[PDB]
């Protein structure tokens, strides 16, 4: 972020910056172990409501331009109704991604489980050699050393495989779960370029040379290339796949 | 008597798994209750070994300690 | 509606065969539940297939006479 090698909060000037100048800002108990990990799932629950809420609301914004746009001239009566809905599919595309989010939670929920299990052998081990501390401070002639020395021998065993199961899987499953989570991300950004890609060619068939008053408009006919590229729009939606990526990282 | 616990413990693990799989095979907690019994199952094989290994030696010094 | 029984029934015995094995693995019951289950198996594969042999041929019919 732009505050790599800044003290500041002011965003360095780029390429696009440079092009054009920036707008102005806009005007609007549990165990021990399984702590940190489990409060992110809260995070990543929050995200989802509220990028649903996001999603409902710009279908309703969709759905309630066309019905302003229809009290208007031939062309734009048209245009407007096209336009909202190539609009309304970015709510359909939030959904799936949002669906994808979730197994993405529930990976890292497995994760939460497993560590949170696996804490209790861990405490137990600590409370034998404690125990076993203070009965050796107490007095060293107790016949009780020689069994507790017996079973944290035992305890320590099966620690010493808890931790390396745990381990085991823990970077198995984080990268999976990361992989498919950016998997998702990209597939998501590649559709919706494309279909705003695809969307502002809608707005090369709108007329837009001034009339002076007292003067007819010609008669608009453009409902085949208005039809048209919905239809491909639609082709292209359904035939893009995961290896025709056109993003080609450097 | 101290021994007994661990293989309490390991029967207790196994029943538990047994009803959630009577129950619902697609519950999740299936797999980190496998991964335990592994655990369980390895403590519980060494504690046998320990107990067998300490029985009769300490029984026959104890006995010849009593004929003599 | 005659059809779906069978895959009701099925399904009830192999819930029965599920609980009988999670309770008691000993019982002798689990030998004839596993033999009626075969046969209920086969039953029902039979019956799909019956059912779906029928549904497109009487579909298909009636729409082209509706149509006409």
Same mark, same amino acid.
């Given at each position: 972020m732009h505050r790599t090698y800044?003290?500041?909060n002011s965003r360095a000037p780029t390429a696009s910056q440079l092009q054009n100048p920036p707008p102005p800002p806009s005007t609007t108990?549990?165990?021990?172990?399984?702590r940190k990990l489990s409060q992110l799932v809260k995070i990543e629950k929050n995200?989802?409501?509220?990028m649903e809420l996001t999603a409902n609301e710009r279908r309703?914004?969709?759905?309630?331009?066309? %019905?302003?746009?229809? #009290?208007?001239?031939?062309?734009?009566?048209?245009?407007?109704?096209? +336009?909202?809905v190539l609009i309304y599919e970015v709510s359909e595309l939030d959904d799936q991604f949002i669906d994808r989010y979730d197994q993405y939670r529930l990976t890292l929920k497995s994760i939460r489980d497993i560590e949170g299990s696996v804490q209790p052998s861990r405490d137990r081990k600590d409370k034998i050699?404690?125990?076993?501390?203070?009965?050796?401070?107490?007095?060293p002639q107790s016949p009780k050393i020689e069994?507790?020395?017996?079973?944290?021998?035992?305890?320590?065993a099966e620690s010493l495989v808890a931790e390396a199961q745990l381990s085991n899987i823990t970077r198995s499953?984080?990268?999976?779960?990361?992989?498919?989570?950016?998997?998702?991300? %990209?597939?998501?950004? #590649?559709?919706?370029?494309?279909?705003?890609?695809?969307?502002?060619? +809608?707005l090369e068939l709108l007329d837009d040379s001034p009339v002076t008053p007292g003067e007819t408009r010609p008669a608009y006919d453009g409902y085949e290339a208005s039809k048209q590229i919905i239809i491909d729009a639609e082709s292209a939606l359904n035939e893009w796949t995961l290896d025709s990526a056109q993003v080609k990282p450097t």
């Open positions: 800044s003290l500041r108990f549990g165990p021990e172990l399984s995200v989802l409501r509220s309703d914004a969709a759905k309630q331009l066309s %019905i302003w746009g229809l #009290e208007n001239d031939d062309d734009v009566s048209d245009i407007t109704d096209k +336009l909202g050699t404690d125990k076993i501390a203070y009965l050796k401070y107490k007095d069994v507790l020395e017996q079973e944290l021998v035992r305890a320590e499953k984080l990268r999976a779960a990361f992989n498919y989570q950016f998997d998702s991300i %990209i597939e998501h950004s #590649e559709k919706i370029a494309l279909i705003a890609g695809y969307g502002k060619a +809608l």
